[PDB]
Coordinates of C-alpha atoms in Angstrom, one line a residue:
Chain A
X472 CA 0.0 0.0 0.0
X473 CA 2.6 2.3 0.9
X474 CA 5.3 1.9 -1.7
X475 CA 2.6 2.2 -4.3
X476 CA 2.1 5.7 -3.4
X477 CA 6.0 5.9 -3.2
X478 CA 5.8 5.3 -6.8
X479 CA 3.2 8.2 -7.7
X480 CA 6.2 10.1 -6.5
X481 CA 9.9 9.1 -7.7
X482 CA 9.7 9.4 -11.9
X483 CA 6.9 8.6 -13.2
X484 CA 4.3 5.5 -12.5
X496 CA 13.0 3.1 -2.6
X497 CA 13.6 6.6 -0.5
X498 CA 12.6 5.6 3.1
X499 CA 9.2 5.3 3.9
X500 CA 7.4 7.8 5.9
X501 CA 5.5 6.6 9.0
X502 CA 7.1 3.1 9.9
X503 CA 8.6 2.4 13.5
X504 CA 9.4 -1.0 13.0
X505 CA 10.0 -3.4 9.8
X506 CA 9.0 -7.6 10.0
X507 CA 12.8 -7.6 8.7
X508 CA 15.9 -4.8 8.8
X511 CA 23.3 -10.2 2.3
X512 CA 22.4 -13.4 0.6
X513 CA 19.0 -13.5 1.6
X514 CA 18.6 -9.8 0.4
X515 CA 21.0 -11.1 -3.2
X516 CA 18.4 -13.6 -3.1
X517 CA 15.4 -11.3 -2.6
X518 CA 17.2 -9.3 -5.4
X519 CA 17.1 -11.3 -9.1
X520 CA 13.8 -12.9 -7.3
X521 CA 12.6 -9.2 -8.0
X522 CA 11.3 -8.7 -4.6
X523 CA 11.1 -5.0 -2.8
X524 CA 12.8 -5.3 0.0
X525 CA 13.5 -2.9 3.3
X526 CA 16.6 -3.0 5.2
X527 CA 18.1 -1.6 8.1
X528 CA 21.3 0.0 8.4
X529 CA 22.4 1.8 11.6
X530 CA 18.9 2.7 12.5
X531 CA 16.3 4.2 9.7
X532 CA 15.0 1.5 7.4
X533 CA 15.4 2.4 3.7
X534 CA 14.3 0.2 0.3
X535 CA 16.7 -2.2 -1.0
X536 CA 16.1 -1.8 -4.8
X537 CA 13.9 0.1 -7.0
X538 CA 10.7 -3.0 -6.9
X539 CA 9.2 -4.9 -9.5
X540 CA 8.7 -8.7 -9.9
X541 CA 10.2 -8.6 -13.5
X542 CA 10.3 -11.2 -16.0
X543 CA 12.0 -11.2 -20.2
X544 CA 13.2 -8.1 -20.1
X545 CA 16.6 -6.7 -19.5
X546 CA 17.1 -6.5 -15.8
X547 CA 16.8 -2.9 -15.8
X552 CA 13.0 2.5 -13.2
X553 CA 13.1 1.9 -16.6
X554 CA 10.0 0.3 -16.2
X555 CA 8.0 3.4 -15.4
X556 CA 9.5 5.6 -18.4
X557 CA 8.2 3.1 -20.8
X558 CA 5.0 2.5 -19.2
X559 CA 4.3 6.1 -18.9
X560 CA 5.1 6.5 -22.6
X561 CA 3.2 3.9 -23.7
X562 CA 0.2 5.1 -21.8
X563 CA 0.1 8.0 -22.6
X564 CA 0.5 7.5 -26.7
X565 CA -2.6 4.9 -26.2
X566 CA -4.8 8.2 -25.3
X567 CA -3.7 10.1 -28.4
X568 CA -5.7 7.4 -30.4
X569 CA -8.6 9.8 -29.6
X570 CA -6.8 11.8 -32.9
X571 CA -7.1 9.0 -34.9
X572 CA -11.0 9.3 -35.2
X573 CA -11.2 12.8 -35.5
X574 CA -9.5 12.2 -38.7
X575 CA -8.9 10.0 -41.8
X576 CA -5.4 8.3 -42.5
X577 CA -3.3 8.7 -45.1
X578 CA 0.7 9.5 -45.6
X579 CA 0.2 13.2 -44.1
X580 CA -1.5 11.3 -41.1
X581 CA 1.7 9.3 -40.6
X582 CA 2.9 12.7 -40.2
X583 CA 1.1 14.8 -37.8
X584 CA 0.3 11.9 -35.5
X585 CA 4.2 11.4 -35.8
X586 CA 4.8 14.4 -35.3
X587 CA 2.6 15.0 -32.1
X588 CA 4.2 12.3 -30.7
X589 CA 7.7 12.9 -32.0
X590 CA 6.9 16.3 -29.9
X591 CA 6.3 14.4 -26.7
X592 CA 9.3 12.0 -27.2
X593 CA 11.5 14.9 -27.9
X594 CA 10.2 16.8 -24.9
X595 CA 11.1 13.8 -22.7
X596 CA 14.7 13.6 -24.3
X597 CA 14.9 17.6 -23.6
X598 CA 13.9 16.9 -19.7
X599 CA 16.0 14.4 -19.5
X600 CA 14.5 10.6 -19.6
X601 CA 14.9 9.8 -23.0
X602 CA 18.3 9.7 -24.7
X603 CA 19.8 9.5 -28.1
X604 CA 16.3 9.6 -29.4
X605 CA 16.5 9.4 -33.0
X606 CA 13.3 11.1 -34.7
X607 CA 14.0 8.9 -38.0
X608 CA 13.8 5.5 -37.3
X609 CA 12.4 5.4 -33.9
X610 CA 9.2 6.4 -35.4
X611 CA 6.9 4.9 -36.8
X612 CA 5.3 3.2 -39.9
X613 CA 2.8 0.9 -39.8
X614 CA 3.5 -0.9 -43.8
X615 CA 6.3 -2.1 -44.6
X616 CA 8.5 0.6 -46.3
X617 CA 7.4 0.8 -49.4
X618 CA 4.2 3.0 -51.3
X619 CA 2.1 1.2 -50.0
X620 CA 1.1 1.7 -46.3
X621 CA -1.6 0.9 -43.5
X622 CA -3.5 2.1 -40.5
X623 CA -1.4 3.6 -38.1
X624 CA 0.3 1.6 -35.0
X625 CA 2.9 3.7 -33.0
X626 CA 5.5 1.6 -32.6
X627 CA 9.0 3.3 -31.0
X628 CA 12.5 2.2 -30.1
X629 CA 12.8 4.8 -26.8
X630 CA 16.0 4.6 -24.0
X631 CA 15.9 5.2 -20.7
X632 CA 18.5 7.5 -19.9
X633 CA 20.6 5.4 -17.9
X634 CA 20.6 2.2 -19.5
X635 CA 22.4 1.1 -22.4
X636 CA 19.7 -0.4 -24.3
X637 CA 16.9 0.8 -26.6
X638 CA 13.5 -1.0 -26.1
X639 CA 11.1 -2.1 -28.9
X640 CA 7.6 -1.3 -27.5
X641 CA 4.4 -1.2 -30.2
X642 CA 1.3 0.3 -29.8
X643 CA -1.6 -0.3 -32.4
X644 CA -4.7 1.6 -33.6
X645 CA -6.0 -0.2 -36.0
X646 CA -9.1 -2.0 -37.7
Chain B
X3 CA -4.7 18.5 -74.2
X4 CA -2.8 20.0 -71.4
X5 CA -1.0 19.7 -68.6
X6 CA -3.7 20.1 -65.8
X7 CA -1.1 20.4 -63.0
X8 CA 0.8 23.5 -64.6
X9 CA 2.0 25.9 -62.0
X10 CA 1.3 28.4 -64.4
X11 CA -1.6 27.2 -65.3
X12 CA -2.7 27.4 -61.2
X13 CA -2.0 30.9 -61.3
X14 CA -3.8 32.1 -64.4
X15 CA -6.5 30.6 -63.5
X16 CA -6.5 31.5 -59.6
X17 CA -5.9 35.3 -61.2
X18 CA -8.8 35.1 -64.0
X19 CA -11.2 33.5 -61.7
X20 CA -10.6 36.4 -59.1
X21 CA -11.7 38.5 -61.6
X22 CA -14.7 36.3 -63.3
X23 CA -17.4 37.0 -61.1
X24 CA -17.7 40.7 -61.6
X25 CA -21.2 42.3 -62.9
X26 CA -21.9 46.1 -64.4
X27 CA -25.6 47.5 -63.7
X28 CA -27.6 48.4 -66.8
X29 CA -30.6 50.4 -66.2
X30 CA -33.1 49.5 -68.9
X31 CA -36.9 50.3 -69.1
X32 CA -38.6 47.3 -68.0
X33 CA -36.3 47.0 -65.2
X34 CA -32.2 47.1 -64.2
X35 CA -30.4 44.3 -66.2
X36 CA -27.3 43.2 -64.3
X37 CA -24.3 41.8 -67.0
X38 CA -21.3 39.6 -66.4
X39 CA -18.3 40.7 -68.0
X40 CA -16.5 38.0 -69.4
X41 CA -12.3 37.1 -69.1
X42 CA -10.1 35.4 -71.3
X43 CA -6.5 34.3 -71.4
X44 CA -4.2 35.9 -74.2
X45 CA -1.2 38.0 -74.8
X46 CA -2.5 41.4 -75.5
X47 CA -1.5 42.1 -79.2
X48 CA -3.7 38.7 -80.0
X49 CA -7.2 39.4 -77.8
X50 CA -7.2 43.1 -79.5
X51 CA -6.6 41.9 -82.8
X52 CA -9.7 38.8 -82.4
X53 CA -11.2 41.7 -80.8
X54 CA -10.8 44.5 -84.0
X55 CA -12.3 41.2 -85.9
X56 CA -15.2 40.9 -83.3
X57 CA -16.1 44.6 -83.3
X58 CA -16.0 44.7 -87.4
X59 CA -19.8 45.2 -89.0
X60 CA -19.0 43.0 -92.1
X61 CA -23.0 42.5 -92.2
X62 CA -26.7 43.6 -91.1
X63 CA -26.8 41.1 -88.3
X64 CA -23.2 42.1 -87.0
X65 CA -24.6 46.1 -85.9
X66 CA -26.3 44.8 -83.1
X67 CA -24.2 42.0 -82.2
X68 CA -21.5 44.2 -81.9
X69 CA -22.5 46.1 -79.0
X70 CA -22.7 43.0 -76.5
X71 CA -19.1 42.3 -77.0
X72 CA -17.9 44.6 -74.9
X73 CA -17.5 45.1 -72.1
X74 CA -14.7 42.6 -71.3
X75 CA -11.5 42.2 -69.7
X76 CA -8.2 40.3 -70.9
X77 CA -5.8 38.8 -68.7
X78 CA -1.8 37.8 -69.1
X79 CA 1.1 36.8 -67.9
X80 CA 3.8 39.3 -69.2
X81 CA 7.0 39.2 -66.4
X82 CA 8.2 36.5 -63.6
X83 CA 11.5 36.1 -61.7
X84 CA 12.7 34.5 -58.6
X85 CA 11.0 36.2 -55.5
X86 CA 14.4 36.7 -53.5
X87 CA 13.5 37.0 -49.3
X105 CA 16.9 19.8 -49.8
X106 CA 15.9 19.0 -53.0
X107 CA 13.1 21.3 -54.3
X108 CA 9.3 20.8 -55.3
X109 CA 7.0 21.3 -51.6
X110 CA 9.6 22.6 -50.6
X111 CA 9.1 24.6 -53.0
X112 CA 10.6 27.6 -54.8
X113 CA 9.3 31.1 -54.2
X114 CA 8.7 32.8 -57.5
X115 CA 7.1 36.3 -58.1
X116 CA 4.5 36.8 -61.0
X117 CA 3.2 39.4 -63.5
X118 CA 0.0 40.2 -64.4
X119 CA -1.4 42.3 -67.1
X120 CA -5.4 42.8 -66.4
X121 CA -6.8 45.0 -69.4
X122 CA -10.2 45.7 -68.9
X123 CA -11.9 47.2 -72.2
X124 CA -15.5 49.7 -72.7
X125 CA -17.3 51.1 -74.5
X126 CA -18.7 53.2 -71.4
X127 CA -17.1 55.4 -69.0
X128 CA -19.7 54.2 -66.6
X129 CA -19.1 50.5 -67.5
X130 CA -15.6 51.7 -66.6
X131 CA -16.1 52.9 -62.9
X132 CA -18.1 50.1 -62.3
X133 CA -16.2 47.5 -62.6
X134 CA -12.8 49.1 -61.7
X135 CA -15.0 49.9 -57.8
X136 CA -15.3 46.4 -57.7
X137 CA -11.3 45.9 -58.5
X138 CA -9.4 48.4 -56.7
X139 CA -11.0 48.2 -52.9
X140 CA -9.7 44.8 -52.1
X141 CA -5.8 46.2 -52.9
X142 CA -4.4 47.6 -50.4
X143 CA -1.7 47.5 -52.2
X144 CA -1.5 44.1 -51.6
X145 CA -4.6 41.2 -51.1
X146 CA -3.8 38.3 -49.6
X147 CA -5.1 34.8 -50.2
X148 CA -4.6 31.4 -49.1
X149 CA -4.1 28.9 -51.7
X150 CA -4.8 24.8 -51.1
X151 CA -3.4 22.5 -53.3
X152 CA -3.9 18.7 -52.7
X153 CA -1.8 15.9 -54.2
X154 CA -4.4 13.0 -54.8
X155 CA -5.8 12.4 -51.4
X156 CA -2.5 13.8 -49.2
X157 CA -2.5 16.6 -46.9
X158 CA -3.6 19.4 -48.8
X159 CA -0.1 21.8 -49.2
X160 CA -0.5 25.1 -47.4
X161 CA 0.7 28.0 -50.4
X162 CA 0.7 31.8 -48.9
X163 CA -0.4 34.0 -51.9
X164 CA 0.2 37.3 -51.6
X165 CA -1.1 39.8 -55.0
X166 CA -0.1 43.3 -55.1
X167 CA -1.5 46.0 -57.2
X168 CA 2.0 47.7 -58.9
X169 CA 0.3 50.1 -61.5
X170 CA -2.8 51.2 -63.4
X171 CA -3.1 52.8 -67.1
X172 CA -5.4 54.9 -68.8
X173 CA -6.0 55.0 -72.7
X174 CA -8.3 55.3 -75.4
X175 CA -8.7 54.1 -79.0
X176 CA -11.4 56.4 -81.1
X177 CA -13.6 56.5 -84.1
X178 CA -15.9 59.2 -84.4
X183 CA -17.0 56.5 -80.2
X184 CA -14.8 54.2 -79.8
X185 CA -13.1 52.3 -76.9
X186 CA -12.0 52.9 -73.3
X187 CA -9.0 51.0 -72.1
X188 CA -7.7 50.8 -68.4
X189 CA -4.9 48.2 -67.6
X190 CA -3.9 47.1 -64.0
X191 CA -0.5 45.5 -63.2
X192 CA -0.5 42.7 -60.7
X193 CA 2.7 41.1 -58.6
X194 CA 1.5 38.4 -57.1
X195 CA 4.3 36.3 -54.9
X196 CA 3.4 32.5 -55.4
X197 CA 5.4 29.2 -55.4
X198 CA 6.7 27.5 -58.5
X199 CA 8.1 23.5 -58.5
X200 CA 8.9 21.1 -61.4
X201 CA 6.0 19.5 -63.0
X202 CA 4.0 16.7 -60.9
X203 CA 2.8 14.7 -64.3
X204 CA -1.3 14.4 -64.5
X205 CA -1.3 10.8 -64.5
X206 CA 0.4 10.5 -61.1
X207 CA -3.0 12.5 -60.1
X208 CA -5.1 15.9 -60.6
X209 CA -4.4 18.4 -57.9
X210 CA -7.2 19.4 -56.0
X211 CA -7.4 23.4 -55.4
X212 CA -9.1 25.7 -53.4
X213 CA -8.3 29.4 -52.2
X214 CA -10.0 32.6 -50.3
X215 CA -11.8 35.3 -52.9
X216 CA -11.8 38.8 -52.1
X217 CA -14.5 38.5 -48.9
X218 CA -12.0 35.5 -47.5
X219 CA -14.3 33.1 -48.8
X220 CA -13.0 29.8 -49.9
X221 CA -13.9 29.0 -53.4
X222 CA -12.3 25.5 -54.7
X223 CA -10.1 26.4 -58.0
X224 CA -12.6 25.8 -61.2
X225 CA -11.1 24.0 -64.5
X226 CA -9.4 26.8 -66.7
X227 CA -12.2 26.2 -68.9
X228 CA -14.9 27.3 -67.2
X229 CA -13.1 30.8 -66.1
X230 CA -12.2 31.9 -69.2
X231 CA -14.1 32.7 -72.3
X232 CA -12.1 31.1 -75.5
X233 CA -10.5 33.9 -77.5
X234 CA -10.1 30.8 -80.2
Chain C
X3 CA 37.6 21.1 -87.8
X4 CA 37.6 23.2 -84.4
X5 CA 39.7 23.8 -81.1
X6 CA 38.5 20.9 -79.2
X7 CA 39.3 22.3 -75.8
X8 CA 38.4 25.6 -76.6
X9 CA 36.4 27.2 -73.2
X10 CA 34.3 29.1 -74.6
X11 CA 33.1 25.6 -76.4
X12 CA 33.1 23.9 -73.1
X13 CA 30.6 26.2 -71.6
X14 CA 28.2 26.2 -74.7
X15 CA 28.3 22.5 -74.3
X16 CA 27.6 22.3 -70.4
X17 CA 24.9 25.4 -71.0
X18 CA 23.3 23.6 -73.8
X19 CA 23.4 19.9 -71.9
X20 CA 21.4 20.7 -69.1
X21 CA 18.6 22.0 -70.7
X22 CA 19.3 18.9 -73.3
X23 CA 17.1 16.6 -72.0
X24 CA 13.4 18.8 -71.5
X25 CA 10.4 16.6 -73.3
X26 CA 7.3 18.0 -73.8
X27 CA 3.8 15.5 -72.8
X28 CA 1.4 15.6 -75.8
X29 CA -2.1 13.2 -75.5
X30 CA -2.8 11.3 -78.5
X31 CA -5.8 9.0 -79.0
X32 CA -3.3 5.8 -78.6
X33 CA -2.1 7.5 -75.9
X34 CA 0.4 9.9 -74.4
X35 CA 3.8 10.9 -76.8
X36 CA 6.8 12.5 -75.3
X37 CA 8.8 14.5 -77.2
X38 CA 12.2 15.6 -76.5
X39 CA 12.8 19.7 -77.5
X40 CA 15.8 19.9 -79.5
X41 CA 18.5 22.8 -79.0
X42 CA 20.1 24.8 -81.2
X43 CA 23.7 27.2 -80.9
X44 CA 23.5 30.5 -82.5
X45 CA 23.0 33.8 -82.5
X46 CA 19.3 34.6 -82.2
X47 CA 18.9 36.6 -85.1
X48 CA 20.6 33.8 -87.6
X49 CA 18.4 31.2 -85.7
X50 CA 15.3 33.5 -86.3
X51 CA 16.1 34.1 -90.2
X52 CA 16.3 29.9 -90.5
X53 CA 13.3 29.3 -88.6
X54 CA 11.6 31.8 -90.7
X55 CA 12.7 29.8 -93.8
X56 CA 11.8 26.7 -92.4
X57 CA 8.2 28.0 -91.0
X58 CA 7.1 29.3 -94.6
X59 CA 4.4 27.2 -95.8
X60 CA 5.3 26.5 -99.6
X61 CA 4.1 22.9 -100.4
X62 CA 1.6 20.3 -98.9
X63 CA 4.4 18.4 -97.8
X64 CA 5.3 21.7 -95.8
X65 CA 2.0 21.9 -94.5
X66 CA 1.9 18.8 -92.0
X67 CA 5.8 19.1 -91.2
X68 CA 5.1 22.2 -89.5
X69 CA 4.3 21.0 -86.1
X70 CA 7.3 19.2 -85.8
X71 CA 9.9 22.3 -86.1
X72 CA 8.3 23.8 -82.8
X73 CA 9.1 23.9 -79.9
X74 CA 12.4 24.5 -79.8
X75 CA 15.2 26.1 -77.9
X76 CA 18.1 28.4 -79.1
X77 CA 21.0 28.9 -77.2
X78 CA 23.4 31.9 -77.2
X79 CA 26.5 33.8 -75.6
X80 CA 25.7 37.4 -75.8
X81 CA 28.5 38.9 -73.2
X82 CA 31.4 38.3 -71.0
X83 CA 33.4 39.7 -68.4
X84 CA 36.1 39.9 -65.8
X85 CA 34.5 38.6 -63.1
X86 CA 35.6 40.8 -60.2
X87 CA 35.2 39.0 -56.6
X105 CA 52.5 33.2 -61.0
X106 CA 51.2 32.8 -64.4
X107 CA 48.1 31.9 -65.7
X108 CA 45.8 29.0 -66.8
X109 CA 44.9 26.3 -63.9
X110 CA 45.8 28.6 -61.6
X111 CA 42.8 30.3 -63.9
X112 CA 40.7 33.7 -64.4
X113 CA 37.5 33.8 -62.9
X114 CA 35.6 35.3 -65.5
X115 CA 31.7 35.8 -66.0
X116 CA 29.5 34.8 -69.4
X117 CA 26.0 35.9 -70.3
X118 CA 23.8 32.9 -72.3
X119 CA 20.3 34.0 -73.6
X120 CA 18.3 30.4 -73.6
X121 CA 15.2 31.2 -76.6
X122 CA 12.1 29.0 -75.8
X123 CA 9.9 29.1 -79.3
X124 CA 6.4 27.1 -79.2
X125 CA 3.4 27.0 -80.6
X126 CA 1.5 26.7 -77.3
X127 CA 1.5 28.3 -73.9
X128 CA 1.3 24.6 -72.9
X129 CA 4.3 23.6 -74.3
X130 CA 6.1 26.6 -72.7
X131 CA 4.0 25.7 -69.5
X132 CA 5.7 22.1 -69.4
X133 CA 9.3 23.3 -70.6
X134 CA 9.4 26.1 -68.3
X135 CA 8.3 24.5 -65.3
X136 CA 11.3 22.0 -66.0
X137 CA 13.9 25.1 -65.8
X138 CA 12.5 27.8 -63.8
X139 CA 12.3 25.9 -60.2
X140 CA 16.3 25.1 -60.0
X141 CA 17.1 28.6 -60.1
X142 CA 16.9 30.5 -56.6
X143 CA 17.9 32.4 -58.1
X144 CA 21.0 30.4 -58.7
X145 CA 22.2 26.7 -59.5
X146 CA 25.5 25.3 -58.4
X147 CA 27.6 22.7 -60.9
X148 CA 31.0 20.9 -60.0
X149 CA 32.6 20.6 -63.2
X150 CA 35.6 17.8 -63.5
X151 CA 38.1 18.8 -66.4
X152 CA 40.6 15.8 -67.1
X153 CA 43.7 16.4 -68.8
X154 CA 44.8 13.7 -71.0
X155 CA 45.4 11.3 -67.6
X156 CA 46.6 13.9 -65.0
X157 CA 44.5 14.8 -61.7
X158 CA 41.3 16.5 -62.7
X159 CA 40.4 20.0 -62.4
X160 CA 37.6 21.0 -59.7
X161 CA 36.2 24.0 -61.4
X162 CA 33.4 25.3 -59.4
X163 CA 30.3 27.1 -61.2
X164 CA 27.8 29.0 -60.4
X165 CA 24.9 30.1 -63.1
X166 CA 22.4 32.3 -62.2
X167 CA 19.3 33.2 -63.5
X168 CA 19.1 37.1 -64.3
X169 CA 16.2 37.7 -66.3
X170 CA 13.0 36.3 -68.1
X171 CA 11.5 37.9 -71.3
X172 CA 7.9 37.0 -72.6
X173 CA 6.9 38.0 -76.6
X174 CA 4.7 36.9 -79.6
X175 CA 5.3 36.9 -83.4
X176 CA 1.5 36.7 -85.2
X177 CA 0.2 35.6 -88.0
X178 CA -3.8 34.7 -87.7
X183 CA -1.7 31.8 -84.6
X184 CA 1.8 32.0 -84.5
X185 CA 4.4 31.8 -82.1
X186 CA 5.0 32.0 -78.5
X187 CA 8.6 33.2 -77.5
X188 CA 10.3 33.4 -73.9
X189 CA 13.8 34.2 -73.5
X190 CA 15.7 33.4 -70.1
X191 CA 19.0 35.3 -69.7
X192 CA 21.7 33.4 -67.4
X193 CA 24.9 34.7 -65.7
X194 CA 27.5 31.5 -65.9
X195 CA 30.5 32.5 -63.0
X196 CA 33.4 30.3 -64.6
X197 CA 36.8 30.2 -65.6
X198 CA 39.1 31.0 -68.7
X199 CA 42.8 29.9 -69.5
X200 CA 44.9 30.5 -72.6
X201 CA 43.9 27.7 -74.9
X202 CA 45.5 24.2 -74.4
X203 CA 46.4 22.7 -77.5
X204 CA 44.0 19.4 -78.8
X205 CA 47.6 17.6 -79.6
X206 CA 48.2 18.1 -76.0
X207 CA 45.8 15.7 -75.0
X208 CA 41.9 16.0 -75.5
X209 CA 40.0 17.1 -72.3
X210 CA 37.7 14.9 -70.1
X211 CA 34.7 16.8 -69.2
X212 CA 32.0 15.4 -66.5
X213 CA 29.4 18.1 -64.5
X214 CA 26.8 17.9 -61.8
X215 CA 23.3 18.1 -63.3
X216 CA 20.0 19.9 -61.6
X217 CA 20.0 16.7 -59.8
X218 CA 23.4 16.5 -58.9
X219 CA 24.0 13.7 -61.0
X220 CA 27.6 13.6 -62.5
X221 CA 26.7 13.0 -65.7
X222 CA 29.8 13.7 -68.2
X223 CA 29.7 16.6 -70.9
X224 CA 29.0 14.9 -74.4
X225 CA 30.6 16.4 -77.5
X226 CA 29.4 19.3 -78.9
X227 CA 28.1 17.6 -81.9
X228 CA 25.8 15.5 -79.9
X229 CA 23.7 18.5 -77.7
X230 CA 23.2 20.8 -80.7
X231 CA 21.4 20.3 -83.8
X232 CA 22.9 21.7 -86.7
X233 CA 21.0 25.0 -87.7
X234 CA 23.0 24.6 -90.9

């Protein structure tokens, strides 16, 4: 319950928890608790404090991360309201790309995104070629500290 | 028997059709008769010579024939040149335009008229927004601006005989190499005098034939 | 039966081969013929005399080949200069050279098309990397700029007749004493409006003869 909200804070959706006086528990076992992806709290020296960042994570790279891409791929879902306001067609492969281009760049400004590459982390739904489909958003984004570009795809479509 | 995508052709016709919709009152007895004076397309030298031919009583039924043909007003294209502020076609390449409109009378009233209806909307310049769509893409964007350089005043008598008054026309539009017309017909529309968006009509329906 | 590597010659022939390749569209029933407008070197007024010969109507046979002589293209050096920014040639002079291209047509289509082709690489200037080659040495980078000065719009009547636009082009190159052709014959390749390095064919192969 509490690390959840610990989450609406730090980046987007560990630093010691607010209101404990005593944890159940405070170096294998924590190793173990570790690579098993479990969120554990330790003491050191009084004042309890989370072990690692959370998550019960499965294929994937180990790497935080996590909530960059979620959030991303959340919030280019929404923009699908766009699609119906309007028909498809090459210039809609821009304009949707560029509205989102303008929120991936806008991360990579803040700081979040790095080495973003506008051409081909973008996206086009056909193959390359003249001939082309509906939309799906479909983009190579890196967290900024991890070397490692993830392939996430997002689809409006028929 | 043309090619429908011509730049030039876009402008000429954008330009004559401007200019198409433009009516002189004619009190008569029986009531006020309002008439349409018509536009066509031709270097100057040529529309006064067909017109000399027009205006010539070779027979009975020509005298009253005669007087219907005018009024009317000729338009050309007489100067262009690059308009000075990767590859290039939308992007495209910024060229500047030069219009010769030669409006023709019999009537010093006919005249005013229509001129009234001209002049206003030049202040110098008139501004107009200019669609054009490539099949079914996203229409291009083309900023048109038309600026009113010059005006003349002549005659040409017999006896009544004819009043001539010219207006010269920059207007600042976008030139780029051919887009053939079987990779598609543009689409065009653009904003008249009142900002109202009339879609481009087929050269023609603007212009009367001088052939 | 002429100086081979004569500069002058060399920029006629790089002048004359890019606009070499500028084809008209023209629907026929069967379907859609492209024909390729063929350019002529001299001055305008000798060109003019010639076409007038060829243009008279004086058999049947005449008649039909009529429509085949236009459009064309004549293409002419009308001045030169120092162009003002141990020995010399290659270390070379930057000099300056005028070239008025003559578009002739029997339609304002056909200028349309051929126009459009020219006009939108101009803005208002067009860059060219010319290679000269001597014999087997290390090329020559010659860089050259042409840039269009002027445009001039006329007629020439007779009932239709004759549609005639002249662009006026400012080529910033280079001269050198000349080299002799016994010396070695030059290699010649240039960038074309599309940057492609196409390589400068011999004279007799751009121009048709007017003779």
């Amino acid at each position: 319950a509490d690390i959840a909200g610990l989450c609406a804070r730090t980046d987007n959706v560990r630093g010691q928890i607010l209101n404990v006086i005593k944890l159940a528990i405070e170096q294998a076992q924590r190793d173990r608790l570790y690579q098993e992806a479990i969120n554990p709290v330790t003491g050191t020296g009084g004042d309890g404090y989370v072990l690692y960042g959370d998550k019960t994570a499965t294929s994937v790279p180990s790497p935080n991360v996590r909530r960059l891409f979620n959030m991303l791929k959340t919030n280019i879902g929404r923009s699908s309201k766009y699609r119906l306001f309007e028909l498809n067609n090459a210039f809609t492969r821009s304009s949707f790309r560029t509205e989102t281009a303008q929120y991936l760049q806008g991360n990579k400004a803040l700081g979040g995104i790095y080495e973003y590459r506008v051409v081909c982390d973008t996206t086009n739904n056909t193959p390359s070629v003249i001939d082309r489909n509906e939309f799906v958003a479909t983009f190579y984004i890196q967290p900024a500290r991890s070397i490692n570009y993830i392939t996430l795809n997002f689809v409006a479509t028929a | 028997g043309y090619f429908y995508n011509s730049s030039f052709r876009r402008y000429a016709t954008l330009m004559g059709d401007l200019f198409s919709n433009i009516q002189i009152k004619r009190q008569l007895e029986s009531g006020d008769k309002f008439i349409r004076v018509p536009i066509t397309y031709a270097s100057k030298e040529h529309f006064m010579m067909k017109l000399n031919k027009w205006t010539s009583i070779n027979s009975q039924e020509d005298v009253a024939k005669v007087e219907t043909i005018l009024p009317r007003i000729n338009l050309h294209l007489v100067d262009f040149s690059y308009n000075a502020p990767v590859v290039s076609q939308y992007n495209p390449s910024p060229i500047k335009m030069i219009y010769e409109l030669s409006i023709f009378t019999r009537y010093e009233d006919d005249m005013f008229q229509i001129v009234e209806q001209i002049l206003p909307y030049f202040q110098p310049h008139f501004n107009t927004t200019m669609y054009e769509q490539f099949g079914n893409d996203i229409p291009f964007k083309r900023d048109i601006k038309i600026v009113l350089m010059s005006a003349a005043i002549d005659e040409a008598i017999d006896g009544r005989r004819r009043i001539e008054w010219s207006l010269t026309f920059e207007v600042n539009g976008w030139m780029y190499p051919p887009v053939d017309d079987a990779e598609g017909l543009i689409r065009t529309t653009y904003t008249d005098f009142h900002a109202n968006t009339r879609d481009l009509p087929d050269g023609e329906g603007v212009f009367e034939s001088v052939d």
